[PDB]
Amino acid sequence: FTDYKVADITLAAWGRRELIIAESEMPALMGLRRKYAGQQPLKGAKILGCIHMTIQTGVLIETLVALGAEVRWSSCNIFSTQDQAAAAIAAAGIPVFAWKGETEEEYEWCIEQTILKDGQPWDANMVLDDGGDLTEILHKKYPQMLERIHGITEETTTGVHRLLDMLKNGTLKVPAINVNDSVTKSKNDNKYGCRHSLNDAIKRGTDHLLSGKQALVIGYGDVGKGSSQSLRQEGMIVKVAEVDPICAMQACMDGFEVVSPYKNGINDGTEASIDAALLGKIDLIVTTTGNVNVCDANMLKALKKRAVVCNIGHFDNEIDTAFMRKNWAWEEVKPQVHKIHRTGKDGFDAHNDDYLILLAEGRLVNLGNATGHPSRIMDGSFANQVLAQIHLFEQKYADLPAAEKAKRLSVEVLPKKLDEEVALEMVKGFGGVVTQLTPEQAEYIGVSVEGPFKPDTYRY
Amino acid sequence: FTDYKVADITLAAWGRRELIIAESEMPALMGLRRKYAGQQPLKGAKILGCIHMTIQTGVLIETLVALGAEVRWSSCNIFSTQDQAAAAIAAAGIPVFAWKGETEEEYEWCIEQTILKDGQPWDANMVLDDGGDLTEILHKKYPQMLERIHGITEETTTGVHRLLDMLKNGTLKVPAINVNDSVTKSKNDNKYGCRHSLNDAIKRGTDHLLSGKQALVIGYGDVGKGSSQSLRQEGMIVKVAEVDPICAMQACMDGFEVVSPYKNGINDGTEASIDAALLGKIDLIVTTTGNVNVCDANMLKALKKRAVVCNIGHFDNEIDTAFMRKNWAWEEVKPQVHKIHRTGKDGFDAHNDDYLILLAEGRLVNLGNATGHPSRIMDGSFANQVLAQIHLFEQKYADLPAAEKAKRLSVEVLPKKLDEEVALEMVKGFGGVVTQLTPEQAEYIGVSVEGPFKPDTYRY
Amino acid sequence: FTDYKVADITLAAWGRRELIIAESEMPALMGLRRKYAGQQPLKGAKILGCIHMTIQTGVLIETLVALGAEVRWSSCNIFSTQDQAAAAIAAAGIPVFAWKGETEEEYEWCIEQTILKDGQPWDANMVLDDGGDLTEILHKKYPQMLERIHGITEETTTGVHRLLDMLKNGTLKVPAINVNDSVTKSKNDNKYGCRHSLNDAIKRGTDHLLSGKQALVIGYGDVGKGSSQSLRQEGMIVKVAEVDPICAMQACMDGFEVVSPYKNGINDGTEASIDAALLGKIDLIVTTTGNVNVCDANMLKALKKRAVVCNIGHFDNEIDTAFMRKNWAWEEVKPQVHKIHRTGKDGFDAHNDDYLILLAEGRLVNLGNATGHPSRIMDGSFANQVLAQIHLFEQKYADLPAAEKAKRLSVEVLPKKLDEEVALEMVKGFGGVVTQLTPEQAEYIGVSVEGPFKPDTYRY
Amino acid sequence: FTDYKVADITLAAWGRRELIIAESEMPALMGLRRKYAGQQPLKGAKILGCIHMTIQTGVLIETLVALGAEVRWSSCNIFSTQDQAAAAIAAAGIPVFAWKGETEEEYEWCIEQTILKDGQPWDANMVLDDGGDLTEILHKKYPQMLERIHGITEETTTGVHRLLDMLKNGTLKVPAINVNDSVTKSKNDNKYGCRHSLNDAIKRGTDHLLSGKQALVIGYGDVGKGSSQSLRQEGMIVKVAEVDPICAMQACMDGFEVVSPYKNGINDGTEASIDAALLGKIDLIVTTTGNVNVCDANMLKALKKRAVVCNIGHFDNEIDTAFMRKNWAWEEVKPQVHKIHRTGKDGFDAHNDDYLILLAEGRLVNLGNATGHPSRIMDGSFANQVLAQIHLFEQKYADLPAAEKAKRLSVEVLPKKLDEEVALEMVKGFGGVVTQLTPEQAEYIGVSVEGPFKPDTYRY
Ligand SMILES: NC(=O)c1ccc[n+]([C@@H]2O[C@H](COP(=O)([O-])OP(=O)(O)OC[C@H]3O[C@@H](n4cnc5c(N)ncnc54)[C@H](O)[C@@H]3O)[C@@H](O)[C@H]2O)c1
Ligand SMILES: NC(=O)c1ccc[n+]([C@@H]2O[C@H](COP(=O)([O-])OP(=O)(O)OC[C@H]3O[C@@H](n4cnc5c(N)ncnc54)[C@H](O)[C@@H]3O)[C@@H](O)[C@H]2O)c1
Ligand SMILES: NC(=O)c1ccc[n+]([C@@H]2O[C@H](COP(=O)([O-])OP(=O)(O)OC[C@H]3O[C@@H](n4cnc5c(N)ncnc54)[C@H](O)[C@@H]3O)[C@@H](O)[C@H]2O)c1
Ligand SMILES: NC(=O)c1ccc[n+]([C@@H]2O[C@H](COP(=O)([O-])OP(=O)(O)OC[C@H]3O[C@@H](n4cnc5c(N)ncnc54)[C@H](O)[C@@H]3O)[C@@H](O)[C@H]2O)c1
Ligand SMILES: Nc1ncnc2c1ncn2[C@@H]1O[C@H](CO)[C@@H](O)[C@H]1O
Ligand SMILES: [K+]
Ligand SMILES: [K+]
Ligand SMILES: [K+]
Ligand SMILES: [K+]
């Protein structure tokens, strides 16, 4: 077996030890493996996967394989691979093209190695994506391959936005499931995973005390809520920026001061518009938005000396790293930790006081400087991914006639009953005990004893 | 002016001082007062109101009056009235029938004084309700009055369930707005209001240290989330019960142990099914469900000696108080605090060790033993109520032809843009500054610079 | 029985109900009652007591009486009495001169009624004091009575400072025990009691949401630590001022921003020295210092409109209330809540926006606007008070010859073994289980299996 | 230069980058460097140092060198060295014998390389020690070298106990400073350092979600307080064991359940004495005691399957690792992470469910699996170490006559004024501003405007 590319195949035994521990932390996902093993619901499935090649993704891959799938795998970020996970999957005879510290060229080459087998399009029929890079490449460069693909299961908020844009423009060629918007994904992974992994990544990259220090979190969606808690629980003094007044109201009620980097919130492109007093007091800035240039050049110029800058949103463009690359000298501390010298770019003084510390070159910090979300949280996301793969593979959209395709070409979420069954396995993994409604109580609140327990309008 | 009934009209000046303070804590609601004063959008409105007669409800009433409405008011709970608020509203010439410590008979007589003026149905044309008692009485006993009513605005989760039941059975006679499911209501009032007011009510009723003690919260919806935080932030060791595995998963991730009062979560009706060891360690139980008999007789028999029992869901039936009234002696400590002697009901021993403390006789504890939610939280709920009253009054359903009525007979929520505008006034009240998107950024995430910023599917 | 003065003797049954509940919350103090009942160690003791006449003080009084003492009692603050507690003690035939809302003249008259019986010095032989007012009056006005007094047991940090000043000046006439510096007092009452009771008092006085709002706590000793936590756990954004850099370092490490009301911390008596930007953002200021004028006139002029001002240190002088009384109009909201109108003092405009809210006229806010510390916390302080009364009464200093007096004239703390026995009863009251050292382990760390477990230098 | 032994000298540039960052996080220590550089107070000092060879210890070493000292250095733990810190110090021409993952034999050889230069006792005259191993070796094996040594500065609680034992037995040969009991050490490092570094080490070793899981912390001294907070802030359900009822009372008031591993707290030596139900629910145990066998064989047999076991007290003996090595198979996951298979010791099944995870082989987990405490915390400890080295070196005990020695042979702490000056530089490093007392205020509380601000009896 040679159909792979990883950093070091000799890490496979370490990877396999970690996979065995992870299996014990992922009861929803291992429950699906155990339930659906007999039935082989993914027999015949040929899955192109593009998602962070971590130990958790390993347990997802081997679940899909155990249910009958074949896969070809790549990471959706240049720094998110755990090399021992990539090695364990390669050593199991699974095609994977992933290492930590890819270049942009190696990243694209790795996605192309999943799409192509022996130099020709693989007989793919399913797509599992995180952030939409693989989905975009298939639509733009391999439209013939999409004729035989039954669906896309999309992990993250940014990738779902890209799918919905394609659906509105009539360019989406196969149906998708929005896995992000299961409650056991969005209100589990996006929030609690960032609570666990943001402070973890800053401590591994810098070993900085956080207690006592001033943080600014840009955004207060699911990731900004979990990020703000990651920092506040360590004793940081956390300020929150938002454009959405409903998310800002939650931040105030959660005990955060809501501030804007710009005077009166107005970003009119000038240095004069920067709240220099506020940014001059900030020791850490974290972007959580999925948006573009929310930590801009003028903010970076105004930050306190030796402030840490990082991004936990899907793509680097949240921070104006291109400005920093043009203007300022980069001194590498160790991989995924750079001192950015604001003195200029004509080399640097090792003793200069005027620098920022950038983590993961502005790429997803939790995965770049630590290991991303823990197994027990990713259990929820990846149980949903498996149920979504089963649903779209069983629906066989590619085999429908043209007029039947038209009725099914949609971006859909999984039913609440499945979201509840995932949650129940998660709860039992903590040793939680869920109460069973009496018939009197089920009748009183108007639900089945078996659920679903809430209307689809319920926000949790 | 004599068209009122309150405890003590001489409390009116104290009530008016508190209303003036509350106005300064309710910028969304006082913003609507200022915006809509010129236009008099509620000129001709005749509103039957049934909601806790607090200082916050006072500011809501005088906002509706300032926009042109006439009202007739009662409380929706026997113990929720603040007698100084009732007095200040009566002293202003507004018809209100409310006092703290009504009997069930006085509670019904107070609703009937709103419905009847000078012994004849009032010419009502709008309904503002909290929990659905007024709505039920109009549908069952005054169907002719609903012919002239343009709509119902319903405050709370339990009242919305009752409206939806009426809509499914085709017994609902007028359209309604679900005010509960604005984000600036459900994920503000229901959660953060209970965070503020639950520990406040237990302290006023008992003056018990909570730190170090064991609590069981039954439910982890919006109210159980806020209630569990109210107790945990004071240092209680909080356990959470749930029937909904998604809410139970959130409890686990929020750092609570999830337990059932029943062995393996199965209530078989018998004493054998009670987890006696768990209930024997609990010092406080709080029901938050909107359901029936979630703290049942067998649980009450098993609780630790001198445990506190209370309910913060809409109706008393959450706790089996009827069992306690049939079997056990009630020793009143002071109003809304009773020792329930488990020795029997043939008088009591003042020195008996074997009792429970019941707050507010099992009625809403935050309103019964304290003052409910604070003005700055109720600002959001009541800004929504005013917007909902304007919308249904302007729509004039009662004046539509039969065939036009059929298209409008619905239970609806307010548009997200209004929810956003309420939240923005709340944020500015904290001194928060919301960032304005650049045109580049608005285009990047596919929203207007003005909002709405989220899809209607977004759960916050 | 007529040898008392209280607000309303008809509250005695309510007071007695609360005392019976408090006994169940005070196991250390009720354990002493049970242990020492046979021995009557305080037979012959005649105790002048001056400490807040709360339900908790009631349980202390009746413990001293049960161990054989007679007492004459007054409160050490004009607003700290709970009238039902004072009534229950009077109705038990115990001399008490206390009500909530005394004037300064009534406060002094009440202490004088304890000192004098039937117009002549009582045959006092022991003193229990909180803050040193009674101790000062005996030294200055009744030196003959001190000839027959065996000791003083002093509750609080401010009173201990006054005793040590008298000891250094050679004016202290009888030995004292510093009850404040038991760990089961200072690191229990001073810290955790203020955590419980500060947010309790602000919510009863104002019903203000605290979440989201800016607080400034002046001080970070035991009371400032508990106060800062009281506010931070509700979601306040808390800033801390300190003069002691070691306490300030703890505040930084506990996740607070450390600020000064004065530019660069320099209080040079000018308006120019005030950090107007900082004070203009503060919604609540709490003084915790035991010092003088730490919230001064220039700070009060600079505070944000409608800010709440309160003191939880022993005496009112922490806030410059005398400035406010000279310059500004006081509008009473309700007892112990005043709007202070910064427009001037020639009456007030009920609708003026430019006011501060002062709680308890600047007197101890927890006791003034709520009920002070909870029974289960005061258990520790008052178990120490009883052990200190036993120790100094048994030592019989008044009966020593002049030369034996000289060797015993000291301010001492209770032994660590007694502090540990109090703590153990407190722990068992939570249902805590303390591990017993093996002989091997006791030998390894160099302690007895029975304790004491720490050297006297240990800070906990 | 060859007078060193490290893992990899090529890590020196990475070490030096991290030392330059650490200097910016250690203002008290770099303030002393700047203040005392002119004076060279340690000119002629020859310091044997034995303390964890981290980046923080690097900044301490180069401060001592900058003040004029020569040093010979080793780590006080086999797994605590950061090999880049060791390399940077060796590359600077400083003798250091340290690497991560020493054997017990290499650990002793490294201490011996400090004591011996070119095969003969070095002309040492000062000792800096953490835990007392170096101190014991000098007293037992190199008594002649102690004739020329002026003093010992001891970092940690366990080492101070060993010094005091030597002083009581009259075997201590040179005076010592207890650096541990500065407030800016004991109530900074021991508590907040463990808050930072315990959850950091468990995450790096296991990547386990902690939220939702059950922890037992054995001990609630400074380390158990910080450890319990490390776990609780991540959402663990934390139970605390203690032998000291005062520390147990603080645990209860801090909102922890206090439990014993043994029924009624009595370890009878037998399996029957184990609370099997409690230990069967624990997912993580952390020892923090400085004591022996506080997580014993019977507890290890009773723990829940797949529980994590770790120690953050000075020495491995807290956990019965000798029992585990005799009975059970050790499967190495990666360095400092072992699965301990409770099936027996005759090899292991890679898929066995019945194991415990042991971190750092039961040695200090924060240093063994992460990087120990952060620079900004160790700033305080190591500013004290430098002040202590200056004081004992200037006192020149070895040069005193026999009779002068007898008056100085003591274990002392640093003066409070120095503890204050360290804390003030720490506070200014957070951007904190300490208020200056007015003369009025200084007189009122009886202190100098310059401090000290507290009596030596004050516990903070
Ligand atoms: N690193 C991880 O492990 C991880 C986990 C899940 C999601 N993600 C990614 O994180 C991003 C956020 O995901 P989410 O689920 O929180 O999305 P979301 O839509 O819930 O939250 C994004 C928030 O950013 C706010 N925002 C937008 N522009 C802003 C601006 N200029 N200033 C301030 N706030 C602004 C929005 O109003 C919104 O509330 C996405 O790119 C998503 O794919 C990463
Ligand atoms: N006191 C107040 O001020 C206040 C404020 C808002 C709402 N309410 C009332 O509180 C109640 C709850 O409102 P909500 O918004 O939280 O509703 P919700 O539907 O969000 O939450 C109720 C929760 O109870 C759970 N539950 C139902 N039966 C249960 C059982 N037997 N055991 C355990 N859990 C069970 C459900 O699964 C659900 O998650 C309603 O009656 C509502 O009208 C009171
Ligand atoms: N209300 C209550 O129930 C209660 C409880 C216990 C104690 N007390 C009283 O509270 C006060 C404080 O007691 P404590 O035990 O916390 O004393 P403490 O000595 O532990 O703390 C007082 C703190 O105030 C600081 N301080 C002094 N002047 C200051 C200034 N100008 N600005 C900022 N900080 C300043 C000191 O440095 C010190 O750390 C005393 O008067 C005590 O008697 C009241
Ligand atoms: N890992 C680190 O970075 C670090 C930092 C500082 C100190 N330390 C070490 O940690 C240890 C503890 O230091 P400390 O400052 O907390 O000491 P401490 O004396 O403050 O606390 C130890 C606690 O253990 C308790 N205890 C003793 N035997 C027990 C038993 N059988 N069960 C339960 N509790 C028991 C004691 O009552 C005491 O309160 C020492 O060995 C010290 O040298 C480690
Ligand atoms: N202070 C208050 N004033 C009026 N209504 C309140 C108050 N506190 C809570 N409520 C309302 O009580 C309703 C339940 O009957 C909740 O939906 C909440 O909106
Ligand atoms: K991970
Ligand atoms: K209220
Ligand atoms: K009290
Ligand atoms: K470190």
According to the annotation, is B223 in a ligand binding site? Answer: yes
Cβ proximity of C224 and C247 under 8 Å: yes
What Rg do the C-alpha atoms of chain A give, in angstroms? Answer: 23
Cβ proximity of D175 and D409 under 8 Å: yes
Cβ proximity of D198 and D287 under 8 Å: no
How far is the C-alpha of D64 from the C-alpha of A106, rounded, in Å? 48
Distance from CA of D264 to the nearest CA of A (A): 25
Segments forming the whole domain that contains residue D315: 187-369
- Exposure b/e, C205-235, CB count within 10 A at least 16 = b: bbbbbbbbbbbbbbbbbbbbbbbbbbbbbbb
How far is the C-alpha of A67 from the C-alpha of A34, rounded, in Å? 9
CA distances from residue A138 to A124, A129, A402, A434, A440 in whole angstroms, order as listed: 11, 11, 20, 44, 53
Instruction: Count Cβ atoms within 10 A of the Cβ of residue A276 and give its class: 0-12 exposed, 13-18 middle, 19 or more buried.
Output: middle
Amino acid at C139: H
Amino acid at C26: M
Helix axes B245-253, A416-430, angle to 10 degrees: 40
Does A428 contact chain D (CB < 8 Å)? Answer: no
Secondary structure element (H or E) that encloses residue D72, with its range: strand D70-74
A362, two tokens: 């502005």
Cβ proximity of A460 and A425 under 8 Å: no
D264, two tokens: 């009624």
Candidates D23, D25, D52, D296; catalytic one: D52
Cβ proximity of B76 and B154 under 8 Å: no
How far is the C-alpha of C448 from the C-alpha of B192, rounded, in Å? 49
**Which residues lie with the beta carbon below 6 Å from any ligand 3 atom?**
C 156-158, 189-190, 193-194, 218-224, 241-244, 247, 288-291, 294, 312-314, 364, 366, 372-373; D 435, 437, 441, 453
Within 8 A by CB and 6+ apart from B360, the residues are B79, B201, B205, B310, B311, B336, B367, B368, B369
D77, two tokens: 């733990």
- Number of alpha carbons in the 13 Å side-chain half-sphere of residue B225: 20
Helix axes D375-395, D27-36, angle to 10 degrees: 30
Does A366 contact chain B (CB < 8 Å)? Answer: no
Nearest Cα neighbor of B312 from B283, B332, B289, B284 is B289
Q: List residues bridging with B358 in a β-sheet.
A: B309, B338
Secondary structure element (H or E) that encloses residue B375, with its range: helix B375-395
Ligand 4 binding pocket includes D76 (Cβ within 6 Å): no
Report how far apart the first and last C-alpha atoms of chain A are (Å, whole number): 47
The rounded Cα D205 to chain-centroid distance in angstroms is 19
Instruction: Count Cβ atoms within 10 A of the Cβ of residue A282 and give its class: 0-12 exposed, 13-18 middle, 19 or more buried.
Output: buried
Nearest Cα neighbor of B85 from B200, B6, B169 is B6
Q: How many CB atoms lie within 10 A of CB A398?
A: 15
Contact flag C236-A214 (C-beta cutoff 8 Å): no
Within 8 A by CB and 6+ apart from D368, the residues are D77, D79, D80, D201, D336, D359, D360, D361
How far is the C-alpha of A315 from the C-alpha of A76, rounded, in Å? 10
In the block, tokens 């491995």 appear at D316
Does A411 contact chain B (CB < 8 Å)? Answer: no
Helix axes C222-232, C245-253, angle to 10 degrees: 20
Length in residues, chain B: 460
Nearest Cα neighbor of B377 from B18, B25, B63, B15 is B25
Amino acid at B16: R
Q: List residues bridging with D126 in a β-sheet.
A: D47
CA distances from residue D392 to D337, D387, D411, D426 in whole angstroms, order as listed: 41, 9, 11, 24
Does B434 contact chain A (CB < 8 Å)? Answer: yes
Instruction: Count Cβ atoms within 10 A of the Cβ of residue D123 and give its class: 0-12 exposed, 13-18 middle, 19 or more buried.
Output: exposed
Collapse the DSSP code of C120 into the 3-class scheme (helix H, G, I; strand E, B; otherwise coil) and give the result.
strand
Searching chain B, which residue's CA lies closest to the CA of residue C199?
B200
Strand C116-117 vs strand C120-121: parallel, antiparallel, or unpaired? antiparallel
Report how far apart the first and last C-alpha atoms of chain C are (Å, whole number): 47
According to the annotation, is B312 in a ligand binding site? Answer: yes
Nearest Cα neighbor of C254 from A203, A235, D430, A257 is A235
How far is the C-alpha of B322 from the C-alpha of D392, rounded, in Å? 76
Q: What angle do CA C410, C415, C420 make, to 5 degrees?
A: 150
Cβ proximity of D398 and C230 under 8 Å: no
Residue to mutate (ligand 1; options A82, A157, A250, A381; most atoms within 8 A of CB): A157
Contact flag A430-B184 (C-beta cutoff 8 Å): no
Cβ proximity of B439 and B449 under 8 Å: yes
Secondary structure element (H or E) that encloses residue B249, with its range: helix B245-253
Nearest Cα neighbor of C154 from C76, C67, C70, C80 is C76
Q: What ligand is nearest to the CA atom of residue D367?
A: 4
What Rg do the C-alpha atoms of chain B give, in angstroms? Answer: 23
DSSP labels, C150-180:
--EEE-SHHHHHHHHHHHHTT---S-EEE-T
Cβ proximity of B70 and B46 under 8 Å: yes
Q: Measured in angstroms, how far is the CA atom of residue A232 from the centroid of ligand 9?
A: 20
How far is the C-alpha of D248 from the C-alpha of D239, rounded, in Å? 11
Nearest Cα neighbor of B308 from B211, B190, B216, B371 is B216
**Phi and psi at residue B364, to the nearest 5°:** -40, 110
Within 8 A by CB and 6+ apart from B52, the residues are B75, B76, B77, B80, B81, B130, B367, B372
Amino acid at C61: I
Amino acid at C314: H
Q: Measured in angstroms, how far is the CA atom of residue B232 from the centroid of ligand 8?
A: 20
C296, two tokens: 């001064």
Contact flag A235-C212 (C-beta cutoff 8 Å): no
Length in residues, chain D: 460
Helix axes C375-395, C55-66, angle to 10 degrees: 30
Ligand 5 binding pocket includes B385 (Cβ within 6 Å): no
How far is the C-alpha of A177 from the C-alpha of A381, rounded, in Å? 13
D368, two tokens: 């063994």
How far is the C-alpha of D365 from the C-alpha of D360, rounded, in Å? 6
The rounded Cα C147 to chain-centroid distance in angstroms is 28
Q: What angle do CA D8, D12, D15 make, to 5 degrees?
A: 115
Candidates D82, D180, D227, D298; catalytic one: D180
Cβ proximity of C127 and C151 under 8 Å: yes
Q: Among positive and negative, which fits the CA dihedral A146, A152, A158, A162?
A: positive
In the block, tokens 């890590």 appear at D11
B252 neighbourhood in chain D, CB within 8 Å: 211-212
Cβ proximity of D178 and D411 under 8 Å: yes
Cβ proximity of D236 and D210 under 8 Å: yes
CATH for D224? 3.40.50.720
Cβ proximity of B154 and B163 under 8 Å: yes
DSSP labels, B14-28:
HHHHHHHHHHHT-HH
Cβ proximity of A110 and A95 under 8 Å: no
Distance from CA of C145 to the nearest CA of D (A): 29
Secondary structure element (H or E) that encloses residue C35, with its range: helix C27-36
Does C210 contact chain B (CB < 8 Å)? Answer: yes
- Number of alpha carbons in the 13 Å side-chain half-sphere of residue B58: 31
Q: DSSP letter at D44? A: T
CA distances from residue D257 to B237, D195, D235, D238, D248 in whole angstroms, order as listed: 7, 19, 15, 7, 9
Length in residues, chain A: 460
According to the annotation, is D130 in a ligand binding site? Answer: yes
**Phi and psi at residue D72, to the nearest 5°:** -135, 125
Cβ proximity of C249 and A209 under 8 Å: no
Ligand 2 binding pocket includes B229 (Cβ within 6 Å): no
In the block, tokens 């369930």 appear at B161
**Phi and psi at residue D64, to the nearest 5°:** -60, -45
Q: Among positive and negative, which fits the CA dihedral A18, A20, A24, A26?
A: positive
How far is the C-alpha of D145 from the C-alpha of D125, rounded, in Å? 8
Q: DSSP letter at D316? A: G
How far is the C-alpha of C25 from the C-alpha of D259, rounded, in Å? 20
Torsion of CA D125, D129, D135, D138, to 10 degrees: -40
Length in residues, chain C: 460
Which chains are adjacent to chain B, needing at least 3 Cβ pairs under 8 Å? A, C, D
Cβ proximity of C389 and C427 under 8 Å: no
Q: DSSP letter at D313? A: S
Q: Measured in angstroms, how far is the CA atom of residue C352 from the centroid of ligand 5?
A: 28
Amino acid at C435: T
CA distances from residue D389 to B122, D48, D124, D383, D452 in whole angstroms, order as listed: 89, 11, 13, 10, 22
Cβ proximity of A302 and A281 under 8 Å: no
Name the residue facing A211 among C211, C237, C253 (closest C-beta): C253
Ion ligand 8: protein residues whose beta carbon lies under 5 Å: B 207; C 371-372
For chain B, helix, strand, coil in percent to 5 are 45, 15, 40
Amino acid at B322: A
Q: List residues bridging with B18 in a β-sheet.
A: none
The three-state (H, E, C) secondary structure of chain A, written as one string: CCCCECCCHHHHHHHHHHHHHHHHCCHHHHHHHHHHCCCCCCCCCEEEEECCCCHHHHHHHHHHHHCCCEEEEECCCCCCCCHHHHHHHHHCCCCEECCCCCCHHHHHHHHHHHHEECCEECCCCEEEECCCHHHHHHHHHCHHHHHCCCCEEECCHHHHHHHHHHHHCCCCCCCEEECCCCHHHHHHHHHHHHHHHHHHHHHHHHCCCCCCCEEEEECCCHHHHHHHHHHHCCCCEEEEECCCHHHHHHHHHCCCEECCCEHHHCCCCCCCCECHHHHCCCCEEEECCCCCCCECHHHHHHCCCCCEEEECCCCHHHECHHHHHHHCEEEEEECCEEEEECCCCCCCCCCCCCEEEEEHHHCEHHHHHCCCCCHHHHHHHHHHHHHHHHHHHHHCHHHCCHHHHHHHCCEECCCHHHHHHHHHHHHHHHCCCCCCCCHHHHHHHCCCCCCCCCCCCCCC
Instruction: Count Cβ atoms within 10 A of the Cβ of residue A108 and give its class: 0-12 exposed, 13-18 middle, 19 or more buried.
Output: middle
Candidates A18, A25, A189, A318; catalytic one: A189
A90, two tokens: 């390669």
How far is the C-alpha of B168 from the C-alpha of B160, rounded, in Å? 12
How far is the C-alpha of B228 from the C-alpha of B220, rounded, in Å? 8
Cβ proximity of C436 and C450 under 8 Å: no
Cβ proximity of B92 and B121 under 8 Å: no
Helix axes D12-24, D83-91, angle to 10 degrees: 100
Does D406 contact chain C (CB < 8 Å)? Answer: no
Nearest Cα neighbor of D78 from D51, D64, D56, D99 is D99
| Quoted resolution (Å) | 1.4
**Phi and psi at residue B67, to the nearest 5°:** -90, 0
Strand D120-121 vs strand D116-117: parallel, antiparallel, or unpaired? antiparallel
DSSP labels, C200-264:
HHHHHHH----TT-EEEEE--SHHHHHHHHHHHTTT-EEEEE-S-HHHHHHHHHTT-EE--SBGG
- Number of alpha carbons in the 13 Å side-chain half-sphere of residue D24: 20
Within 8 A by CB and 6+ apart from C458, the residues are none
**Phi and psi at residue D4, to the nearest 5°:** -160, 170
Secondary structure element (H or E) that encloses residue B86, with its range: helix B83-91
How far is the C-alpha of B50 from the C-alpha of B95, rounded, in Å? 12
How far is the C-alpha of B163 from the C-alpha of B176, rounded, in Å? 8
Q: Measured in angstroms, how far is the CA atom of residue C411 from the centroid of ligand 3?
A: 20
Distance from CA of D88 to the nearest CA of A (A): 14
Cβ proximity of A98 and A73 under 8 Å: yes
Q: List residues bridging with D308 in a β-sheet.
A: D284, D357
Ligand 4 binding pocket includes C453 (Cβ within 6 Å): yes
**Which method was it determined by?**
X-ray
Cβ proximity of A218 and A385 under 8 Å: no
**Window 256-275 of B, Cβ < 8 Å to D:** 256-257
DSSP labels, D118-174:
TTEE----EEEESSSHHHHHHHHH-HHHHTT---EEE-SHHHHHHHHHHHHTT---S
Q: How many CB atoms lie within 10 A of CB D68?
A: 16
**Phi and psi at residue A142, to the nearest 5°:** -135, 50
Q: DSSP letter at D177? A: E
Q: Measured in angstroms, how far is the CA atom of residue B376 from the centroid of ligand 7?
A: 9
Within 8 A by CB and 6+ apart from D222, the residues are D157, D186, D187, D190, D191, D194
- Exposure b/e, B279-303, CB count within 10 A at least 16 = b: bebbbbbbbbbbbbbbbbbbbbebb
